[PDB]
DNA sequence: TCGAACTCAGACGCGGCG
DNA sequence: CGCCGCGTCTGTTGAGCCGATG
RNA sequence: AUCGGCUCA
C-alpha cells in the first residue's frame, strides 16, 4: 500500500521518496514496452532482449545485489530493496520490533548526594513536572480548582503554588525506574522512590554505584515511570533497591562500602601510644563520646571501658552480659551502632575493608534483612562524618625515597659491566649474556622495593613514659594503601622506588630498565619507552567490547527458552563432584 | 625586549641554552598551496605541470591542433569579510592563453593556413585565506593531510596462510601511483605464481613467455649452466673449484692424471685448495653423472631438425649417443640444489600449459575479459595498454627512486614505465630472498609512508577534469569547419568546475574547523590522518598499524591521539618536523666534529637516521668542549645504550622535539603517567572562552608563540605611534623610515566585535594599547577571544585545598564555593542563528508582512511596519520573529459576500500563515538582523534602512582615510603655498579656500597655482570615483538559489553560568562534575580569615599516578606569595628604590638559569608599571622536560614567608574546630568544558509520532522519547516482571486505541490497561506477504 | 495502509530466493546443475522439454 | 556507461578433480 | 576417499552536533 | 530519510 512507502514533501517543492517507488517504475515501464513489442510481432532479437531486461528489473526489485551488480541510484549508492527492509541491524526484526521507542521518559547527568537513604533518589522539579502530567490533571479536576482541561493546562504552565502542592502529593509512594546503558546484567535497572529537589541533575545514592558501574565524571542516566497498578506493585516487590543485595552469579553481597567511608572507619579504630587520657576508665560509650567531643581525650588513645553485649545463643531470644573491655575511644564510639546481636570482637581491630565486609555479612546471617539495611546506611553516614573530621591530604613530602638507593644501582651497574667484559672476551655466548643481565636487574629491583617498604610502614618512632617505641605509621600514602581505599603495593613502588623493566611492542623485554620514578622526574627516552606499553593497553581496551557484546548476544539467544516448569522430575542418578586442587595446592 | 615584553616579564627556570627557535607553526598548508598555484617557469610544479601534461591536442586524422601557452588568475570580486557575510565562495577566475593553428592536408606540412590567438575562461579555483583555511559557501573549512604507502616495490612474508602446513610463504608486490598492481607469490610446495589485480592465480613464467621470448633466451638469462664435453669416448666436466662446497661425493673424485678425493667423502675446504693448486678444470667422469641432470640449451638433429631435447628439459643416456652423433661435443646442464638453486622455475615450466606467445596472450585475454573474441589486435592491445602505456600506467618521480634503491642499482631516475629487465630483477631477488639471502621489509617504518597534502590532491582532481575535457576536444576538432572555428567555442568549462567544486566541499577530508580556542585551530590544521580515498578503514586496520614504532622519535607525537574506535589512525605532527622534497618526514640535528658539538644543523630523513649514532639533549655538555662523562647515552639502529666520547656524530637540537604543541603546554609533564597525560592533552582543546580571560600562573614558556601564530590577534603591520584608539577601531601613524613615498602612511584596523563561531560561541576583540604610545612592528594591538596581552590564557586559576569533605566529593566530584559564582568568573556567551526563506509556490509568491490572519494583537507589539523584530527586544520561547503568509487556493463566490467583504473589507485570497517562531526552550536578546534580496524584487523599507546605514559608515571610513591622507597632503598643500612672499596676518585671516587668488609673480608661480588647481582636480576625481565604486558594490543586488525571493536572518544571544551537574577539568587529566554550591560560611578558612574556593579529593592521586598536580599546586602557592608582598609594598605607598631592589631580588633565584634580567636599565615609570602588572601574582615558566626542581621551588616558598613543607592549618566552617592534621593549599589552573547541563536534560510525556510505523520520534531537537533497546528487555525478563514490559511494548509505544484509552483512564482516576497488537507487527506481515509468501495467522 | 494492488506480467519470471539462495530449491528439485538454469534464464541457450 | 576497486579475516559448506 | 578451490555471512550499546543530496 | 565526519561514558 502507499502509506507503507510514503512520499514526503520538502521545504521547496522537492519530494523525498523511498527507493521502492523507483524500483516499481522501472518494472512498470519495462512491462508496458514489452507488451507493445509483443503485439506487433517484432523480429526475434528485440523480444529476446526485452524479456531479459524485464527479468532483470523484477529480480532487482526482490533483492538488489544478488544476481549481478547492484543497480545504483543517483549517488553511486545501491538501492534499498524489499529483502533489506527486514535484514541487518536496521531492519524490522531488530531495529523496530524488539526494541521500541518509549514515551513517559527522560535522561540527564548524574551526581552524588549522601543525605539519602538507599531506597531514594532525586528528581529535578521540572523533569518531574513534565513526566507526571496527567496525574496532576486528574488531581486538580478532582479537587475542583479547575472545571475543564484547558483550565488545568494554563494553571500548570503558569506554575501557581497549588501546582507544587498537588505535585508533591502525586509522586508520594510512586517508584520510578532508573537505567544506565549499557545494561550488561539484571542489576542494570532498579526501582527507586523520588525526592524532589531543584537543579538539573539526578542525584543518586553512593552505595549503589558499584552495581551500576557508575562514576561521577560525566555519565548519563535515564528515567522511566510505571503507569498501571500491577506494574507499580512489581516495581515495589521485585526490583526495588533494598530487595536484591546478593548477586545472582554467586552469593557475594553487592553493597561493599567503597572508597572514602572505609578510610573514616579505618582512621577511627586505630591506636597511638601516647595520645592523652591514657589509661583512665569510663562507664560506657556515651562518656567516651562526651570526652572526645569536649576535647579532653584524643580520638584514639587506649582506655578500658564497661560494655554490655547481647548473645542470643538461647532458643531464639536474647541474653545480656556485661564486662570491662580493653579498647580505645574510637571503637567505643563505634559500638553505638552495632545492632544488639553481634559480639564485641567485631570492632576490636583496625577495620580494613575486608573487616567491614565481614561485619555486614555477619549481620545478614544472624539478624535477617531489615537490620542489615539500617546498619549499612549508618555505616555510610558515620564513615563520611569521621573521615572529613581528620583532614587527610597528600603532599610532596609523603613520597619517601629510600636512603639506600645509590648503592644498589651502582652495584648492579658494576655487575653488568663485568658481564659485558666477559662477553667481549668471548667466554660466554650471545643469549647467555642477555639472560644473566635481565636476572641481575630484576634482583636489584626487588631489593630496592623491599628497602622502600621497610622504610614506610613502621618508622614512626615515638616515646611515652620512658625511652622509645616503634609503631605502625601515619603517612597519608600508607593509610590510603593499607586500609584498602585506593592503590596497592605495586603502585606505591611506581611512585617511590624503581619503576621496573619495560617491554617493547613485539613482546620482548628491553635490556636497560627505567631507573627513575615519579617523584624525581624521568628522562626523555625513558618516557618515550613507557609510551609503548601505554598505547598497547589503550588499543586493547577499545577493541574487546565488540566481540564481547557479540558473544553475550549469541548466548542469550541460545539459552532463551528454558524456564523452570515442574516440581520434581523423578529422575535417577546424576553426576559426581570431587575437588580439583590438583596440580598444586587448593 | 620588545614593547609587549616590558609590560610583564615571565620568569624562566630553564637551564639548557637554545640553538634553534620554533618555526612558523603552520607552514605545511601555506607552502603546499603556495607551490600549487605559482607560475613555475621550467620545473613543473602546480598548474603548469597539469597543462603541459596534455601538451597540444591534434585530430583523429591529424589535420590541425591547438597549443597551450600560458595562464593567469584574475582578482576576486569580493574580499574575505564580505565573502563570509554574503554567503558565497571565495575564488579566482582562471584565464588561459591559447593558439589554434591549421595545417593543410594537401601539403605534407602546409602549416601556413590559419593562426588564431586568444584567451579562454575555464573554471574558477578557491584560494587560501591568509591563515590556512578555505571559505566555501561562507563556512570556514580546513582540509587535512594524508599519510599513505609509498609507491614502489615491496617484499614480505606471510606466516603460512595455510597454517596447517606451518611453513612461511614469501611474496613480492609492485604498486604504482596510477595503474594496476602486480603480485608474485609462492605456494606450499615451491611453485612461483603471479596475479594481476587480485585476479585468479596463474602459474608463473606465463608472463615470461608473454614477452614473446621462449625457453632458450630468457631461461639462459636465468640460470648460468654447467659445462661438459663428450670427448668421443666419455664425459668430461669442467669444475670451477668453488662449486663443490658443502657437498658430498658419490664416487672417488680424481683428475685426468691423479686421484684427489675419495668416495663417500664431503668436499671440505682443503679439497678445493688442492684442486685450485693443481690448476685443473677438465675432469673425466662416469656418464652416470648425466643420469639425473637436465639439458640447458636446445639441441636438435641438425639434419632433420628434430628437437633432441628442448631447453631446460630432462635427458637420458641414449640421448648421450644422440648428442654425440648429431655433432654435439659439449653438454650444458643445471647446477641444481634446492638449498642453493632449487628448480622453482623448472617446476613452474613443467606445470605451464603453453608453448608460444599466442597461447599465453589468448589465455590472459579471455581471462580478464571473458567471452569477447580474442582477435590478434585484441590480445596485443590488452597486454600492451595494461602495463606499458604512459597513458594508463605511470609510476612517479618518487616511485622510480624507491624502486631503483630497493634493487641496489645506482642511477636514481629514469623512465616512469615498466619494462623487461625490471620484472626479471624482481623475480631474481624474490628467489634470492627465498634461498636465505637478504630479508623482508616492514610496513610501519616512517621511511615507507608518505604525506600528501592540499597541493597534490587538488592537482590530481583538476587533472581528471582536464582529461575529461580533452575527450570532447578531440571529438569536436575532427569534423566541422576550421577556418571560422574560434577555439573558445569548442571547450566546455563545466567538468573542471564540477570536479574542483566537488572536491573542495564534498570529499572525505574537507571538514569544519573547530573554533573553540586558538588550540583548536592550530591543532586541526597540523593533523595527519590515515583514512580517506586510498587508505585504510576503521575496521580493516589490525593491531600492527595502531602501535608506536621506534622511528616516531621526532616526527610524530606519541601521546596525542583520540580514544574512540580510531586510536592510532590519526596523530599530530611534532614541533620541528619539516617535509622532504619527495614527501618523507625530516628532523633537525647538530653536527659533532672531533668531540666538539658544532653549531651547524643538518636535517635527516627516516632512513639515514639509522646509520649514525645520536646523542641526547640531557647529556651534560661540558661548557663548549666535549661531553662530561665517559659512557654517553645514545641510540642507534633503533636501540639505546652507552657509547664513548668520540664515536658520537649528532646531538639533537632541543629538549622538546619529541612532543606536539598540544602537549608541550602542560607543566611538569615529566612527572605524570602516559595515558593520564593523553587525557589532559586531549581535553585541553575543549575549553570555552569566558568573559574576562586570565593568564596562567604556571606555564611552559610556549604560550606566546601559539597565541601569535594562530592569527586571531591583530598584530602591528609597520612601526609607528598610536593616533586614535576606540572600542572598535584603531588608527596608527607610521614612522618616517617605514613610509614609502606614495601615500600619507596611516594604517587602520577594524576590530571584529561579537560574532558567531561555528560551534556557537562568541568571537570578539579588545584594544590593548592606550592613546599616544609607541608601537614597534610585530607587537599585538588587540587581544583575541581567549588571549591576555599576547599570552594564551585558556581558563582561570583558583585556590584549591584538597581533603575529603562529608562525601560531597565522593568519586571525582568537585565542590565549588559560592563566590566563584558571584564574581562571574565562569559565565560565557552563546549566540545562535535562525533563518526564514520565502519562495514562489505554484499558486504564487509568499510575502513578509505584519498583517497575519488569526493572531491576537498581543503578539504583534514587537514587530515594526515591515514585519521584523526590533533590535534589542528580548524574546522567550514561543514568540514571533518574522511575519509570513502563504497564499492558497482561490474558490469563487457569490455577489452578496462580495458586498459584505467589501464593507468589512478584509481579503481576496484567504491565506495560510507560516511565520518563524522561537523553538521552545530558547530565550535571549536579538542583536543583529540581516536581509538578502534578489535583483528585481522591490526593496522593503528596512533593508533600505540597513543598507543606507552601512553606506554611512563606509563613507565615513573612506573620507576619514582619504582625509587623513590629505591631512598630510594638505599640510603639504598649505606649506607649498607659503612660497612667493608672506601675508602673515591675512594668511589665516581669510578662509583657506581663498589661497589660489592672491598676488602672482610670473617667473615661476603660474606653475604653482596651476599645479594647485591640477592636483586638487585629480584628488577630487579619485574621491568621487572611489565612493561611486563602493556604493555600487554595496547597493548591488544578490544571487540566490532558484525559486527564492528574499531571506531574512535573525541572531540571539544568551548568557550561561555555573550550576550543579556541569563539568570541569584541570590540565593533567582530572575530570569532574560539580556537586554542590556551598555558602561562604561553610568553606574551610585558614588561620587568617580567607576561605577556600574548591575542595578536591586526595584519593585520586595514588591510584592514577598523575603527580603533576601536587607540584603545580605548590608552585601556585609560591607564585602568589610574591604578588601579595608587592601588593603590600604598593598600597602602603613605600618608594621606588625598594620596589626595584625586591623585584630584582626575585629574578635571580635559580641554580643556573639562563634568563638574566637586569633592571638597573629600566626607567622609573617603566618599573612602576611593571610592578603594577605583577600585583596579582608573579607568573612563572617551566619548559617541558627541563623543568624546575624541589630545591628551587622551596627557595621560592621561603622567600615569601610561607611554610616550606607546603601545607598549612585549616579550621572548619560550621563548628569552628580545627582539622586534626595539616592540609595542602595552593593555586590550580582549571577550565570550563562545553558539556553543559542545559544541553542534556530532557523529558517527555506525549508528543509527535512517526508516519510509516507509528511510534515516537527521537532526539531533543524534535521532542522525542528515549529508547528501550533489547538489552533492557533481557534485563526486564530476568527479574520476572511481565506486566511491565507488556506495558512498554503496546500501550506506551504502538497500540493506538490502547494509548488513547490509557490516557483517558489516567486522567479519569482509574489505573488500568487495554492492550492490542503492536501495529508495526502487521506492517511486517504486509512486507513479507508482498514478496509472494503467504504469511497469515490462524484463528481460534 | 491496508489495500494492495497487482501488476500482471506479460511473461513469467523467476523468483530469486527460490533460485539463487543456497541449495537452489529448483536445481535440487529438477536435479540439474545450477549453471544450466542460469544460462537458460539469462537467455543464452535452449533446452529440450 | 573508462572506472573503480583493494591488500578485513576467519569460518563453513559445496562443486570439481582426481 | 581426499585435496583443493570458491562465494555467503557474521563483527557493543544508549545519546549530541553540522554540513551534503533528493 | 539516507550518507559522510567530529565527540561523550
Ligand atoms: Mg565514567
Residue numbers in the entry:
A (entry chain D): 246 to 831
B (entry chain C): 3 to 1342
C (entry chain D): 99 to 147
What does the study report here?
RapA is a bacterial RNA polymerase (RNAP)-associated Swi2/Snf2 ATPase that stimulates RNAP recycling. RapA contains seven domains and three linker regions: N-terminal domain (NTD), two RecA-like domains 1A and 2A, two Swi2/Snf2-specific domains 1B and 2B, Spacer domain, and C-terminal domain (CTD), and Linkers 1 to 3. The ATPase activity of RapA is autoinhibited by its N-terminal domain (NTD) but activated with RNAP bound.
Using single-particle cryo-EM, we determined a 3.4-Å structure of the E. coli RNAP elongation complex bound to RapA (RapA–RNAP). While in our RapA–RNAP complex structure, the β' ZBD buttresses the RapA NTD and sterically keeps the NTD from reaching the 1A domain, which prevents the formation of a closed-NTD architecture in RapA. The whole RapA NTD domain (NTD-A and NTD-B) undergoes a significant rigid-body movement with a 72.4° rotation and 19.4 Å centroid translation away from 1A domain and adopts an open conformation. The β FTH motif interacts with 1A and 2A domains mainly through a large patch of hydrophobic interactions, involving residues L901, L902, I905, F906 of FTH and L216, V217, L220, L229, I540, I541 of RapA. The β' ZBD contacts Spacer and NTD-A domains via two putative salt bridge interactions, β'-K66/RapA–D744 and β'-H80/RapA–E14. On the other side, the extensive interface between αI/β subunits and RapA 2A domain is supported by four putative salt bridge interactions, including αI-D164/RapA–R502, αI-R170/RapA–E527, β-D853/RapA–R545 and β-Y872/RapA–R524. Compared to the active site conformation in apo RapA structure, the active site in our RapA–RNAP complex adopts a different conformation, including the possible side chain rotamer changes of three conserved residues K183 (motif I), E281 (motif II) and R599 (motif VI). Besides, the whole motif V (residues S563-N571) retracts from its position in the apo structure (∼1–4 Å) to provide a larger space in the active site. Although a non-hydrolysable ATP analog, AMPPNP, was included in the cryo-EM sample preparation, it is not observed in the active site of RapA in our complex structure.
